[PDB]
Ligand binder design. Structure first.
Ligand SMILES: *[B]([O])([O])[C][N]C(=O)/C(=N\OC([C])([C])C([O])=O)C1=[C]SC([N])=N1
Length: 263
């Protein structure tokens, strides 16, 4: 079946010239709305939620892990390091790295999370441990953002990422204190007002993690507390046919608005 909402998303996609993937979970009734929900998309920085969550899981058995210092060296800097460059020849704690990765999309910070987990496969292993059979992280920053059409590296599906984000932020994949920490981090994101949240009333509370990469890849994953009802989880992924395509956060906002309309 094709619902009215799915028809509108396809219309949006046609006008956009790219490929759009959407997955909604409404936690009031657990119902789902998907558009290309089982197609793979490059995650880009939306993968940082899984990495941060994996380190939060490690911290459940190490009370001091989030305060553990990690050395930042000049050679560690990559393409986008707004927080880590302040700490070169110094240290950042794993909490500071997590916050920088999530709230500023610092890529050096992400590489330190990946290293703490033993490499990209450590992030994938955590995904599997919490029931996500789809997620895969294969590379570090910055090459995990190449976003080449047809490449399975560093991809997931909208369906899988919505389910995982629900389990991490509203369910019991993490301990209570760690879940709260992840939600606090996402709610303090600085990069998201033009993406999913631009399509929802600005008055609704939400947290999100954006992603950007080559092929004009423009992504967002969000947990949303709408006024008067149970939270939503919403994934919007978008990627374009040209390697040097421009960002299209407006397409994510438009997808979110269509979903909101549909409630
Ligand atoms: B993540 O997807 O937010 C990390 N993003 C990147 O590394 C890319 N751009 O990030 C900045 C510079 C902050 C931006 O302009 O979006 C990136 C990697 S490949 C590419 N074309 N853009």
């Amino acid at each position: 079946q094709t619902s009215a909402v799915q028809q509108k998303l396809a219309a949006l996609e046609k006008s956009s010239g790219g490929r759009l993937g959407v997955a909604l979970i409404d936690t009031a009734d657990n119902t789902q709305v998907l558009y290309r929900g089982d197609e793979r998309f490059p995650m880009c920085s939306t993968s940082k939620v899984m990495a941060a969550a994996a380190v939060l899981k490690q911290s459940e058995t190490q009370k001091q892990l989030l305060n553990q210092p990690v050395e930042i060296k000049p050679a560690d800097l990559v393409n986008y390091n707004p927080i880590a460059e302040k700490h070169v020849n110094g240290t950042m704690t794993l909490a500071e790295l997590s916050a920088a990765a999530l709230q500023y999309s610092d890529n050096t910070a992400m590489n330190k999370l990946i290293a703490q987990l033993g490499g990209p496969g450590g992030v994938t292993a955590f995904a599997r441990a919490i029931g996500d059979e789809t997620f895969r992280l294969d590379r570090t920053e910055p090459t995990l953002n190449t976003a080449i059409p047809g490449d399975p590296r560093d991809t997931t599906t909208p369906r899988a990422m919505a389910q995982t984000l629900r389990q991490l932020t509203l369910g019991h994949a993490l301990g209570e204190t760690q879940r709260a920490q992840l939600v606090t981090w996402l709610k303090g994101n600085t990069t998201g007002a033009a993406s999913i949240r631009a399509g929802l009333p600005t008055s609704w509370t939400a947290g999100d993690k954006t992603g950007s990469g080559d092929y004009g890849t423009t992504n967002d994953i969000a947990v949303i507390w709408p006024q008067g009802r149970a939270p939503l989880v919403l994934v919007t992924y978008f990627t374009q046919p040209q390697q040097n395509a421009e960002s299209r956060r407006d397409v994510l906002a438009s997808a979110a608005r269509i979903i909101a309309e549909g409630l």
